[PDB]
Amino acid sequence: ELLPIELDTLVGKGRFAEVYKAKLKETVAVKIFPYEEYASWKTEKDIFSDINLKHENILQFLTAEERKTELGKQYWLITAFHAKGNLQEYLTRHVISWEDLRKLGSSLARGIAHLHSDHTPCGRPKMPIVHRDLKSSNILVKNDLTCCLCDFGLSLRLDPTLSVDDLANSGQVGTARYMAPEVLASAMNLENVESFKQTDVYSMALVLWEMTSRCNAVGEVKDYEPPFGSKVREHPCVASMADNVLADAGRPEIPSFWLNHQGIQMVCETLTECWDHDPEARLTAQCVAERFSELEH
Template identity: 75%
Template sequence: MQGRTAVGDFLHAYKHPPARASILKPRQLCKFCDVRATTCAVCHNPAHKLYGLVLEDYNNSKCEMKERKGMGSQFFICSCSGEECNEHIFFNSYVNSQVVSVILVSLVPLLVMAVLVITSFYCYRVYRQRQASSRRKRGPPLDFSDGRAIMIDDEGSDSSSTHANNLNHNTELLPIELDMQVGKGRFAEVYKAKLKQGSSVSGEQGFETVAIKIFQYDEYASWKNEKEIFSDADLRHDNVLHFLTAEERKVQRQYWLITAYLPRGNLQEYLIHHIISWHDLWMLGGSLARGVAHLHSDHTTCGRYKVPIAHRDIKSSNILVKSDLTCCLCDFGLALRLDNTLSVDELANSGQVGTARYMAPEVLESRINLENIESFKQADVYSMALVLWEMISRCNAIGEVKEYEPPFGNLREHPCVESMKDSVLRDRGRPEIPDRWINHTGIQMVCASIEECWDHDPEARLTAQCVAERFYDMEYLDKLSDRSDSEEKITEEIFVVDEK
């Protein structure tokens, strides 16, 4: 009926409507309660209140449901006056406020996280771009056109450690031209080589000299072990050979280690061709002890923790001589990282290694204490003592200097383990220390340290650090020796002048 508003059971049916806008057609909705039978209780006169409410929109042509507050619960009502206007009911523009709150609570943290992630990624990209720009300004790792030497090519300077360990992850092979072979060992050959440095201003090709240690394919294990030892940044030390990179040369079926080139060669060769002074001995011996002490130490010079390393093949031919007459340890093919996580079985699998002439008694006898990693250091100290003996044998401070002989020179050139057992274990033999050697105070002190270092009982031996400290304490003797040399020269000059 025109002008009348239909209300009834549908009011109660929509007290809790759906949360989104929709067009619904409820069941049992009366259209005109004065025409057809329905479940409607009444057809309402809009002039009167309904449930205490005044129907303000009864002139609408559509039945648009609206929420009315203050009814004790969610309450929706519509009124209209059009022809069969209550045929369809609308919940236009309605969104449940609780649903909105839930959506906001759910989405806001996600949006915040997304903003943080995007911001962090952006900052990281900017940081990496600045790093890359900085590296480009300094020059790429493989381009040495800045002229900074990473190796030596003359007697007056040593290799710089500036680029040491910076090339470990190269994907491209370095441009290297082999020059000549300068050494050969059990596992590899060593070559002097030229590392191309890029074109100079004059257009001529520049080079830097490097040493290349070449392993054949069947010596992969030795190359891998030495590469892993060298790759430890904590190994870097003035008395350890500077390492550049390792390469697999598939075309030549070879593995390469690229290191500093030291033209003075190894200590054995140097002692063969040179007689050294007390000052030279003090420099060589002290630096050797410092190098071994650094290997054995469980911390770096700046106090940071490092894994101790046992060299296990210390001998004069595995020690290089730098231009300042200090020692430099090399050849880590048999070295062992003394990690506390290593089991006794893993240590036992390392086997009896080293050079027989320099093996400690317990190594020769295969009775090294595998439960104590200090045992490996003690074996190194024994070998170091033999090298110190070699130095003294060629020092002019002892008086008459004989031709170079290695320790246990009475044995054949390359004695086997059994021969060394007879000399070192059965006879308890050690290289001879003549009485005339101890006439020099400094030599006497070094000899005392040597005898403590090659003691038959590993536990009684000095540590490399203790030997290094003893050499440091001898510095005053070295200064006295320099003063004596100067006084002798002055006396000789006066004598010559008087004769004239």
């Protein structure tokens, strides 16, 4: 019943699990959850097991397994392995081209638009998913320099059976640095879903800014810094983020010289709309995916 796997190296650590590069008797990623984190494993398993989720910008799922150990039991998620690792690490090490920015930006928007969509590309109905923890460290870089979504531990399936009371606590979920102003404010319209899609678009805007900040088409490129790196501490709290994002209406800096390049100007105008204080003023991920396809000459 169990797959012939040999764990090689610890490559990552998420909030609920450890990620290993492994040999399948070829190279796969094994995400290992302890018994205590069973709910996170089940949440990811349920998303990855949905056949309607399958997309080139969503991490390929192989199987889930329960593995008895001497000390107890582990819960595994076996997926495709992307050697280039996460986008934050990638942008820290590399200065990207305009072409790289277009491929990474468009694949990110396509992946998010697919999660958010109530239909498959072929028109069949599907469950929308909201990621709820989008950030550069959660995005995998494929060998062809396109994006790939993973880490669905905090994700929510937008099921019609969802209660208004269940969505309350829950509470503020995610990484404080990437939380939308309405999440930081505890100002969400829990009465309507799609308000959750808008929070994912805000986080996507910060990621698009990170990609843009390391693109040689801007002219002079600075060393990589995460969004708000120069204003907040390493692991910021919701209060410190609220003071910046909400009270000071603070957003990562876009120097005027970046706008000299027509492509960079279009990307900047788009991401600026996507991080608007008002969730209703934000573009949809589908709109962003369309704007990136317009960048093709």
